[PDB]
């Protein structure tokens, strides 16, 4: 009734139209734990990096935004060591009309622009507001560490 056919429909349309620099799907035959996979934008030091996502839908998913975290360790201010994502539409800006593909559009968009005024890490936000040569270096540095 409540949950399953909503999830399977959004799965089906990504199987119809796959995202270009992204890809997502379930972890095996467990419908309520998926796996996403993205590539970084070319106008970023996040380029060249591939990132995997730990995904957990809740039991009231079409009416609660999901719990989704990163797997790869990244030099990013809006991402902690847990891979928690300080993103707006993952919270009270949620609408049930939102598709996970459109959610994944917002994720690389945060990797594109990097809104610093929600400092999930304090130190990286200070580096980004002071020295772009320090920030853009270490992101490609930890890309070669982790996101290869």
């Amino acid at each position: 009734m409540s949950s399953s056919k909503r999830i399977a429909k959004e799965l089906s349309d990504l199987e119809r139209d796959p995202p270009t620099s992204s890809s997502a799907g379930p972890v095996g035959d467990d419908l309520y734990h998926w796996q996403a996979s993205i590539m970084g934008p070319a106008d970023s030091p996040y380029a060249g990096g591939v990132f995997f996502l730990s995904i957990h839908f809740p039991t009231d998913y079409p009416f609660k935004p999901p719990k989704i975290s990163f797997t790869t360790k990244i030099y990013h201010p809006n991402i902690n060591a847990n891979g928690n994502i300080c993103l707006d539409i993952l919270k009270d800006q949620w609408s049930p009309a939102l598709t996970l593909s459109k959610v994944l559009l917002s994720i690389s968009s945060l990797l594109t622009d990097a809104n610093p005024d929600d400092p999930l890490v304090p130190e990286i936000a200070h580096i980004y507001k002071t020295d772009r040569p320090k920030y853009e270096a270490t992101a490609r540095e930890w890309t070669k560490k982790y996101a290869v």
Binding site: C86, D88, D92, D117, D118, L120
Partner: protein, 76 residues
């Protein structure tokens, strides 16, 4: 330019604009009545964001088009 913008509880206000304004120049005539920060300038126009750092000449607001000002609760 007479354009429209509406709040959560039903309140809407009236103000002027220009075709060569910016989205914070929309906001520049938003804190002149309420006194709200331009970091909280939040526009929900048909399911997508209207970004603040852009100009007005990209976001297809026509004569007396209605915008949607909700205050932000950003952070974490």
């Amino acid at each position: 330019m007479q354009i429209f913008v509406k709040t959560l509880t039903g309140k809407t206000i009236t103000l002027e604009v220009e075709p060569s304004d910016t989205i914070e120049n929309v906001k520049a005539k938003i804190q002149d009545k309420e006194g709200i920060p331009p970091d909280q300038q939040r526009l929900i126009f048909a399911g997508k964001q209207l970004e603040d750092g852009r100009t007005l000449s990209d976001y297809n607001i026509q004569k007396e088009s209605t915008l949607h000002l909700v205050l932000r609760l950003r952070g974490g």
